[PDB]
Amino acid sequence: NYTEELKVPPDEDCIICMEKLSTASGYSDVTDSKALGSLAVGHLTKCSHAFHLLCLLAMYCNGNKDGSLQCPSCKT
Ligand SMILES: [Zn+2]
Ligand SMILES: [Zn+2]
Known part of the structure; x- marks a missing residue:
């Protein structure tokens, strides 16, 4: 993961x-x-939210192209 992982999933969904x-x-x-x-579950260091890492890696192919993924929440 490229985002401060969370021992447990938050309530942000x-x-x-x-x-x-x-x-x-x-x-x-x-x-x-x-x-x-x-x-x-990891909150992108960029904005610091939370979302299924895997999921992001999916649409991450569109933006935040560097070596991690983009934030689907606020498109961060
Ligand atoms: Zn998901
Ligand atoms: Zn965000």
């Missing part, structure tokens, strides 16, 4: 699959997950 941050990544079905498996 994912923003990609729009699912509870407790459950898991909704795109886990079809996603180019590298090492985010499908159960890692």
